[PDB]
Amino acid sequence: ECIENYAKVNGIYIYYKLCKAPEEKAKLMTMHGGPGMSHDYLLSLRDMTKEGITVLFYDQFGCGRSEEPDQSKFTIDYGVEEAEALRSKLFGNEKVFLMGSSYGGALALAYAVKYQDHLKGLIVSGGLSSVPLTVKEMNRLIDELPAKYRDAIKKYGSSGSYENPEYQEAVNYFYHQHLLRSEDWPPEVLKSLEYAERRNVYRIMNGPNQFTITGTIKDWDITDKISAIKIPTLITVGEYDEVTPNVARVIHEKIAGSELHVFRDCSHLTMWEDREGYNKLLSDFILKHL
Numbered sequence: 107e108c109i110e111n112y113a114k115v116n117g118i119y120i121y122y123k124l125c126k127a128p129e130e131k132a133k134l135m136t137m138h139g140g141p142g143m144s145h146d147y148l149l150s151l152r153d154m155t156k157e158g159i160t161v162l163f164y165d166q167f168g169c170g171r172s173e174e175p176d177q178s179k180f181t182i183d184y185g186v187e188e189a190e191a192l193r194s195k196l197f198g199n200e201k202v203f204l205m206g207s208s209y210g211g212a213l214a215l216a217y218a219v220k221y222q223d224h225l226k227g228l229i230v231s232g233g234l235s236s237v238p239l240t241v242k243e244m245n246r247l248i249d250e251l252p253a254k255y256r257d258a259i260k261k262y263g264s265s266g267s268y269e270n271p272e273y274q275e276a277v278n279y280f281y282h283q284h285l286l287r288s289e290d291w292p293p294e295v296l297k298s299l300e301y302a303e304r305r306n307v308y309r310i311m312n313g314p315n316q317f318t319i320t321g322t323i324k325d326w327d328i329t330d331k332i333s334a335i336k337i338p339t340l341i342t343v344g345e346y347d348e349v350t351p352n353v354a355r356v357i358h359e360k361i362a363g364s365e366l367h368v369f370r371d372c373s374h375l376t377m378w379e380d381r382e383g384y385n386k387l388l389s390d391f392i393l394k395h396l
């Protein structure tokens with residue numbers, strides 16, 4: 107199996123899981139989303155170790171098994187310096203590939219903008235360069251929901267009654283439509299969702315749920331900076347993704363030479379809805395840019 111341990115980054119203990127591939131061809135670092143979830147739901151990407159790709163997983167600050175820094179450090183900027191400090195501490199000067207999912211994709215983009223010189227490639231899945239845009243698109247999806255659920259979200263969401271049964275029902279319907287399409291949710295996914303509700307990062311940085319971003323990153327938007335990224339980039343997004351293909355398009359437009367793939371019949375957690383297809387696509391991309 108993989109090796110698990112604690113890395114002293116910026117003064118705090120960060121949990122990481124390094125799954126080395128037999129005949130290593132390259133290293134892939136991963137950034138889970140939320141913000142405030144855990145690496146757990148990205149474990150399906152371990153399959154790539156069979157493709158000669160070593161995958162590094164880690165729980166970001168205040169997430170999962172990792173320690174929580176001062177609240178003042180709950181920022182994407184800190185997350186970027188944490189990722190770099192971890193890369194440097196584990197791989198030194200070796201250049202690696204960086205993959206990010208949702209908020210992790212935003213974190214990956216922020217990282218690339220400042221440290222692309224340390225990367226060989228970039229992969230963004232269900233990621234975003236703009237929170238406001240993501241919010242606007244998610245609101246559109248909410249208006250496409252059945253009246254019942256649409257009114258429940260607006261009514262209780264405006265009164266801050268996220269605990270309400272009717273609201274919970276609307277959230278569930280939305281998730282099975284744009285988060286993880288009607289299937290059989292794996293333990294890895296449930297663990298990440300629970301970790302988010304238990305720690306404090308999600309509530310402070312993100313908000314109550316997936317489609318309600320009232321946290322501290324609500325105005326975050328680096329769409330005007332990502333265009334500086336000049337490294338091979340793979341952008342993936344689900345057809346029914348809660349972070350719409352429109353949002354993905356905005357990233358694709360700014361990154362020259364980047365590739366955009368829209369997974370049909372898939373949503374946000376594409377690495378579980380089409381595990382084989384997802385892992386194949388990423389490994390294909392990685393192996394062509396050594």
Ligand SMILES: CC(C)C[C@H](N)C(=O)O
Binds near residue numbers: 208
């Ligand atoms: C709403 C966005 C932050 C996306 C999603 N909550 C995630 O980062 O997993």
